[PDB]
Amino acid sequence: MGAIAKLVAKFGWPFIKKFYKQIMQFIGQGWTIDQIEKWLKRH
Numbered sequence: 001m002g003a004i005a006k007l008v009a010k011f012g013w014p015f016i017k018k019f020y021k022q023i024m025q026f027i028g029q030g031w032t033i034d035q036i037e038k039w040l041k042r043h
Contacts, residue, residue: 006033011040 004027008016016023019040026036 003027003033007036007040010037011042015042 004016004024007023007027011023023036023040026039031039
C-alpha cells in the first residue's frame with residue numbers, strides 16, 4: 001500500500017478491481033505513478 005493508493009486515489013476500489021491483475025502488476029514491474037494513471041486514464 002504505497003504506490004497502489006497513488007493510482008486508486010483516481011481510479012478507486014471498484015475501478016482498480018476491474019484490472020487489479022494488470023494494475024498491481026505495473027507497480028511490481030517498476031512503473032511510475034504516471035505510467036499507470038496515464039496507461040489507464042479511466043479507460
